[PDB]
Tab-separated table of N, CA and C and ligand atoms in Angstrom:
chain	number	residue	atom	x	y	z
A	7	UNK	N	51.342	-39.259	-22.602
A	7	UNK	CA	52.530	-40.077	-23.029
A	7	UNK	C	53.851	-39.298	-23.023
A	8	UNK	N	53.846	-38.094	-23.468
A	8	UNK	CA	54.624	-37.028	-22.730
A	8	UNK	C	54.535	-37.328	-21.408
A	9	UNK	N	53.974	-37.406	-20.630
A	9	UNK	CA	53.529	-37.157	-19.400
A	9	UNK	C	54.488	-39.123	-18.922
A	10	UNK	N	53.945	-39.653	-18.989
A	10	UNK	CA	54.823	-40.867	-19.263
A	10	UNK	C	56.161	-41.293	-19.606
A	11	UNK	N	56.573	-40.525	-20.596
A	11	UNK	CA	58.215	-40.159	-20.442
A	11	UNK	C	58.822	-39.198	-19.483
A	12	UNK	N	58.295	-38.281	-18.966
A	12	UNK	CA	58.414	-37.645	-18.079
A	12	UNK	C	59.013	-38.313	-16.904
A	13	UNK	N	57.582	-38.802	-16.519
A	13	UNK	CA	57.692	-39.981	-15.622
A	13	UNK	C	59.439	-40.731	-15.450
A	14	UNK	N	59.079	-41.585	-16.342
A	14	UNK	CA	60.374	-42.267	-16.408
A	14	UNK	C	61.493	-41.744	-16.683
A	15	UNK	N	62.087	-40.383	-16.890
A	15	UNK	CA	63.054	-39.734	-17.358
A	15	UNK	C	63.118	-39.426	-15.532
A	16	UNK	N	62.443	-38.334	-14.927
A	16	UNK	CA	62.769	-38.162	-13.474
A	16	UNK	C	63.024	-39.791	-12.704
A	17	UNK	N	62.144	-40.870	-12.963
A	17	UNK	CA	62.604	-41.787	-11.870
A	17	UNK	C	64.104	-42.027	-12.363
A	18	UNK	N	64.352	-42.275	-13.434
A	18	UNK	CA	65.715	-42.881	-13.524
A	18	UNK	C	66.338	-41.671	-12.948
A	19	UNK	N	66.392	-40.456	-12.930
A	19	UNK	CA	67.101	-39.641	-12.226
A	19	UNK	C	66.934	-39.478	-10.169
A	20	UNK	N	66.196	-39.605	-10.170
A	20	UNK	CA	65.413	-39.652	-8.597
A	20	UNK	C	65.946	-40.965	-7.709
A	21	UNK	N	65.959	-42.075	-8.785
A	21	UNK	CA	66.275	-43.282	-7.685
A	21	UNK	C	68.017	-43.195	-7.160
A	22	UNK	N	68.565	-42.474	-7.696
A	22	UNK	CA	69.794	-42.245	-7.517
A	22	UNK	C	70.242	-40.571	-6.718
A	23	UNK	N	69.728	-40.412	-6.248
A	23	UNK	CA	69.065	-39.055	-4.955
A	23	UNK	C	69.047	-39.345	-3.729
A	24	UNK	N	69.108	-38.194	-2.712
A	24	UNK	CA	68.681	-38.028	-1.410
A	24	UNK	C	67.426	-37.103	-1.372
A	25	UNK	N	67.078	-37.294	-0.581
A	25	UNK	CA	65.778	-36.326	0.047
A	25	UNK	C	66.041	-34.753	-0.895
A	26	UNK	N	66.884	-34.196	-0.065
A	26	UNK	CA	67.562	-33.088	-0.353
A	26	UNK	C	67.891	-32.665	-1.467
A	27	UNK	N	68.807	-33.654	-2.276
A	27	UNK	CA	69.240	-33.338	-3.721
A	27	UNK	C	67.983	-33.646	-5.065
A	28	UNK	N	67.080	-34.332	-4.339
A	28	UNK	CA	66.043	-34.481	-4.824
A	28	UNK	C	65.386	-33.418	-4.885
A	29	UNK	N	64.995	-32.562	-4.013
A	29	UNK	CA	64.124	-31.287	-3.485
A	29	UNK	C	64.760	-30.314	-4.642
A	30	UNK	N	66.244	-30.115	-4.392
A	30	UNK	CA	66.733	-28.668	-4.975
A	30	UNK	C	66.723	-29.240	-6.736
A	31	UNK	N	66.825	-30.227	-7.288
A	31	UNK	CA	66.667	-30.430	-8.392
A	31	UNK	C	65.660	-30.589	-9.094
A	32	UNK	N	64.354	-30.836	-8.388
A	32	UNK	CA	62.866	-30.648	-8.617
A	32	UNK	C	62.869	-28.844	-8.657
A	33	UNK	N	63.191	-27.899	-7.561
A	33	UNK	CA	63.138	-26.430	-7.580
A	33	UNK	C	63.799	-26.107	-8.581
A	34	UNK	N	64.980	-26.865	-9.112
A	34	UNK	CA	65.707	-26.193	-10.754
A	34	UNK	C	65.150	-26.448	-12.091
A	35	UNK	N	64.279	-27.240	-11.766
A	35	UNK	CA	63.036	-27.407	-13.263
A	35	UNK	C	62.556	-25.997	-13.356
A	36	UNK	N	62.350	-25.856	-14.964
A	36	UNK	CA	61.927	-24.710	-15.646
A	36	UNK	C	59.961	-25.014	-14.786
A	37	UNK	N	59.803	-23.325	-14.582
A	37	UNK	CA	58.344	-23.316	-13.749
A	37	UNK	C	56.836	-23.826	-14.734
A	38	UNK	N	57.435	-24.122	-16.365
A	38	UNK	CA	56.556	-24.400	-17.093
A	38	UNK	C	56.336	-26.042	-17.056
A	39	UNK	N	57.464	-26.617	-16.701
A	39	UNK	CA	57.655	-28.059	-16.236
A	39	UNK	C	57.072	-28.258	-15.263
A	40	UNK	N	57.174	-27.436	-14.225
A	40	UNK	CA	57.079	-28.148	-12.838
A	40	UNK	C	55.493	-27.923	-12.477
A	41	UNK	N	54.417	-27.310	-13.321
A	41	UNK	CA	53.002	-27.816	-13.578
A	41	UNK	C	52.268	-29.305	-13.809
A	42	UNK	N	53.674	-30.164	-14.253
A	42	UNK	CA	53.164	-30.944	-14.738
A	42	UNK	C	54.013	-32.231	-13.770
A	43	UNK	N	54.671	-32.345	-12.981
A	43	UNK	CA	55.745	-33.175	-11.995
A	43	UNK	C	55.290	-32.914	-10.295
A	44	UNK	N	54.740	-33.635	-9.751
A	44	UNK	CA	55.008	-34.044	-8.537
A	44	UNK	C	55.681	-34.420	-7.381
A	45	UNK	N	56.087	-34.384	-6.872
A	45	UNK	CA	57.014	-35.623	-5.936
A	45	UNK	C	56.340	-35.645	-4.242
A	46	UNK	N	55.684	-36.734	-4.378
A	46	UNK	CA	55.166	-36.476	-2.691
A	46	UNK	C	55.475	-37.283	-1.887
A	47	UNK	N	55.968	-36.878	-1.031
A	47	UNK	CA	56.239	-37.987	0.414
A	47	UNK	C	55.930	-38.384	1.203
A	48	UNK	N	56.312	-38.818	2.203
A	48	UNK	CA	55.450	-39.918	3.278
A	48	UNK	C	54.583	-39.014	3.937
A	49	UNK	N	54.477	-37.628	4.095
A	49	UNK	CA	53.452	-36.910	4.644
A	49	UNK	C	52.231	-36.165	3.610
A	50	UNK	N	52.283	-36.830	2.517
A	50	UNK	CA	51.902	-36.135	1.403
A	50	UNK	C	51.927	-34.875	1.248
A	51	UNK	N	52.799	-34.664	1.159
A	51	UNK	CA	53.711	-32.859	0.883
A	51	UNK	C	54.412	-33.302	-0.173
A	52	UNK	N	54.099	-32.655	-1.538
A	52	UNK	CA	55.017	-32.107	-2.530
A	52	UNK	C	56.341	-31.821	-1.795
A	53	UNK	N	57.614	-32.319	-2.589
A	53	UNK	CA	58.887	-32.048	-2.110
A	53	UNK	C	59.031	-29.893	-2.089
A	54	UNK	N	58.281	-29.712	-2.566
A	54	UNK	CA	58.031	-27.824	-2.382
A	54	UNK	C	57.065	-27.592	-2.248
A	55	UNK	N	56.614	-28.425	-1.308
A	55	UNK	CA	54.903	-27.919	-0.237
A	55	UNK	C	54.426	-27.511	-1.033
A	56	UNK	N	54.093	-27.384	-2.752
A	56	UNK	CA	52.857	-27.077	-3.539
A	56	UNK	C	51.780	-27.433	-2.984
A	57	UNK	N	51.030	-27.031	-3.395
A	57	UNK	CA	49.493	-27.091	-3.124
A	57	UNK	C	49.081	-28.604	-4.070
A	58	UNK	N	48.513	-30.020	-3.543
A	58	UNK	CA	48.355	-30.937	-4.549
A	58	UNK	C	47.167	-31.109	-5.588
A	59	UNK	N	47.562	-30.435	-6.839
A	59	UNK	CA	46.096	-30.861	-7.562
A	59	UNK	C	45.575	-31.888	-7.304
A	60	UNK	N	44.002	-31.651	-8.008
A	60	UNK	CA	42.924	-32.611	-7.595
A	60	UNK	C	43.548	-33.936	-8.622
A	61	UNK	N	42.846	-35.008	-7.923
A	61	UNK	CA	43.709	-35.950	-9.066
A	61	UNK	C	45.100	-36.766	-8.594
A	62	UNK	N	45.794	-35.693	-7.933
A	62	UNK	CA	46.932	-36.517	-7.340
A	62	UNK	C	46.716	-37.621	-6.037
A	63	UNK	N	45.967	-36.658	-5.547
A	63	UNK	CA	45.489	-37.706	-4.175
A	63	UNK	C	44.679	-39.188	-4.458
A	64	UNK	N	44.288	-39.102	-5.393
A	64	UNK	CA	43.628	-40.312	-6.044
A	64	UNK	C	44.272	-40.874	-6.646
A	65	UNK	N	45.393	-40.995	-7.217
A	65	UNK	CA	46.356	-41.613	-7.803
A	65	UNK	C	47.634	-42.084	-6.698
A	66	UNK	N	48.160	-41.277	-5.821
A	66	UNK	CA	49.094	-41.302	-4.689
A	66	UNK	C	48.612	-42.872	-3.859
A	67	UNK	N	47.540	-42.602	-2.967
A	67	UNK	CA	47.285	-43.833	-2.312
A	67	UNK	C	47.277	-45.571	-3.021
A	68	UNK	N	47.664	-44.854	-3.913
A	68	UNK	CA	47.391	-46.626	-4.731
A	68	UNK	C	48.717	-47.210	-4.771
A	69	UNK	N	49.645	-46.032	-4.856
A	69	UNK	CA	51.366	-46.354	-5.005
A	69	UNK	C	51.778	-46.754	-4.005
A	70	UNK	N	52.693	-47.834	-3.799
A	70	UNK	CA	52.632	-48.920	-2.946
A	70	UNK	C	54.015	-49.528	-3.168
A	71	UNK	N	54.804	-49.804	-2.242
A	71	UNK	CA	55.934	-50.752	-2.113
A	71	UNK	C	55.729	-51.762	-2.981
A	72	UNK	N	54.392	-52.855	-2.728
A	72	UNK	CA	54.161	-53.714	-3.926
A	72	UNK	C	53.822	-53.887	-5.186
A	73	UNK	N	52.943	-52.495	-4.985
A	73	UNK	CA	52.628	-52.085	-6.369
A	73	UNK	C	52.905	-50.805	-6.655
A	74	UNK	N	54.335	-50.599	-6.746
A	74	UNK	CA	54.803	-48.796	-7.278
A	74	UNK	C	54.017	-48.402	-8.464
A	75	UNK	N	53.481	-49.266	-9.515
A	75	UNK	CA	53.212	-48.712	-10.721
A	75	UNK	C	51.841	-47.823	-11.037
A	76	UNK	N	51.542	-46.739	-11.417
A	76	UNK	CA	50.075	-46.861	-11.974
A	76	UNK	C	49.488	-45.546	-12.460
A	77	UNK	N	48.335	-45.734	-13.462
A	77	UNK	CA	48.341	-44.712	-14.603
A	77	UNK	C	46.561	-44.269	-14.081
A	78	UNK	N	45.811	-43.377	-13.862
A	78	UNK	CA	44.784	-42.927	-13.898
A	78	UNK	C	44.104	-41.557	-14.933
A	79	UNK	N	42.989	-41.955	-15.413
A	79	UNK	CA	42.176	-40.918	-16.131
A	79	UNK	C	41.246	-40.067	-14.745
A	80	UNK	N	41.153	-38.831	-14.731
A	80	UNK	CA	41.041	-37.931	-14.125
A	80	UNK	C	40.724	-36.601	-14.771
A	81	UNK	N	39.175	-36.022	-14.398
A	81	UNK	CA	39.456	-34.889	-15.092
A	81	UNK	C	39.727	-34.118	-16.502
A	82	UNK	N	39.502	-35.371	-17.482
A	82	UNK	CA	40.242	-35.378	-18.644
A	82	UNK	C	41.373	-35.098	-19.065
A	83	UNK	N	42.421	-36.128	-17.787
A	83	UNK	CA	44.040	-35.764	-18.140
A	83	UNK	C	44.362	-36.989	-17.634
A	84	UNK	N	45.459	-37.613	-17.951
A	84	UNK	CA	46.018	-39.087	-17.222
A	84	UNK	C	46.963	-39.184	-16.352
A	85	UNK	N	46.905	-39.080	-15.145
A	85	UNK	CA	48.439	-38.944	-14.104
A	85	UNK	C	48.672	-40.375	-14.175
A	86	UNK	N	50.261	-40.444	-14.324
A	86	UNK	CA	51.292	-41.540	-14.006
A	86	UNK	C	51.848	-41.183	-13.040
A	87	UNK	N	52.008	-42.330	-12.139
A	87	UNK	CA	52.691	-42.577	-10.556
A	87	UNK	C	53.337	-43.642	-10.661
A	88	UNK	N	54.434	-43.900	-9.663
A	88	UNK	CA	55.930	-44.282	-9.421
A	88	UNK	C	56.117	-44.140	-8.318
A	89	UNK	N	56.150	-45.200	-6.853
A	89	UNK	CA	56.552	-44.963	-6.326
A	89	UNK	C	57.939	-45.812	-5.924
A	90	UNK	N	58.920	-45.071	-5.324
A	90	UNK	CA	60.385	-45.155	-4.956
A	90	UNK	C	60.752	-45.185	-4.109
A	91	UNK	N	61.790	-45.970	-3.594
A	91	UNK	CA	62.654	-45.306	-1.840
A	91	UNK	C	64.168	-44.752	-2.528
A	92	UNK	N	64.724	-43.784	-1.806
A	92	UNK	CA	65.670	-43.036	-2.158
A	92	UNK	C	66.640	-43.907	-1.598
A	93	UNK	N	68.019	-43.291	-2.039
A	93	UNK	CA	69.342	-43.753	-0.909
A	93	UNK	C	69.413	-43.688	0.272
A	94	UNK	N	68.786	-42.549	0.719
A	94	UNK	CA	67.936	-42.181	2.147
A	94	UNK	C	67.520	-42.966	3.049
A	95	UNK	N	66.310	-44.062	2.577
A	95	UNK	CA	65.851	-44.702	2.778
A	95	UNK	C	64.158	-43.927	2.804
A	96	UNK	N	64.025	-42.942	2.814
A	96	UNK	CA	62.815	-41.875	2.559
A	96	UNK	C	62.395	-42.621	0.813
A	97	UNK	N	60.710	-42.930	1.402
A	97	UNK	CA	59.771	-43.200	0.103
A	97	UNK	C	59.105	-42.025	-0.312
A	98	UNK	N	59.091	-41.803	-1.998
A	98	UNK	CA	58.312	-40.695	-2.623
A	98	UNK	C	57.409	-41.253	-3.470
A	99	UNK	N	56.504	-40.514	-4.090
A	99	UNK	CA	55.514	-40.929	-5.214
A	99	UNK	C	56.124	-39.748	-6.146
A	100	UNK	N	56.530	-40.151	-6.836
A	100	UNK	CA	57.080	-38.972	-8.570
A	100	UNK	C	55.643	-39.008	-9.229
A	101	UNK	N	55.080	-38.608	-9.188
A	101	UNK	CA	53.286	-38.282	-10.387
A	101	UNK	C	53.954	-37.244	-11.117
A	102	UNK	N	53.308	-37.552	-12.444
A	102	UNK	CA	53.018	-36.850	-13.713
A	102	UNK	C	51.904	-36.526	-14.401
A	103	UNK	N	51.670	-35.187	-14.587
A	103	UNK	CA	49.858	-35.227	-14.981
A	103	UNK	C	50.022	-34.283	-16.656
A	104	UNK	N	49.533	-34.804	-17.753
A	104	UNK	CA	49.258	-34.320	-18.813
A	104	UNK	C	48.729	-32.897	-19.090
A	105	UNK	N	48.995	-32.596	-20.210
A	105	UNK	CA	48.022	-31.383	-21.328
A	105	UNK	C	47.569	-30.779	-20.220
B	1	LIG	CL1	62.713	-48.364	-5.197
């Protein structure tokens, strides 16, 4: 639920972004944050080519133009997903994964 405000604190910041300004402002999160924030794109690459925990990929494919919304148990942690199109016109998935 942390993990859930999270969520929604980056989209309201993200939907108002480019590709780019998106990228370098995800890299200016503190490195204890950015354990827990995602952003993957149409090639499923993390906006900083991280490596994708387990868990994300199972949550990612479900996020959908029609259905951006959705919350999964995993692992004993809950990722929230969001997916978005930028000003760009470039679609991301913002995931958030708990504790
Ligand atoms: Cl959107």
């Amino acid at each position: 639920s942390p993990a859930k405000r999270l969520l929604f604190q980056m989209v309201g910041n993200a939907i108002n972004r480019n590709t780019q300004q998106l990228t370098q402002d995800l890299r200016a999160m503190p490195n204890w944050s950015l354990r827990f924030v995602y952003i993957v794109d149409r090639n499923n690459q993390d906006l900083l080519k991280r490596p994708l925990p387990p868990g994300i990929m199972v949550l990612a494919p479900r996020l959908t133009a029609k259905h951006p919304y959705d919350k999964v148990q995993d692992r004993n942690r809950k990722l929230y997903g969001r997916h978005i199109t930028l000003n760009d016109g470039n679609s991301v998935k913002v995931v958030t994964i708990s504790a």
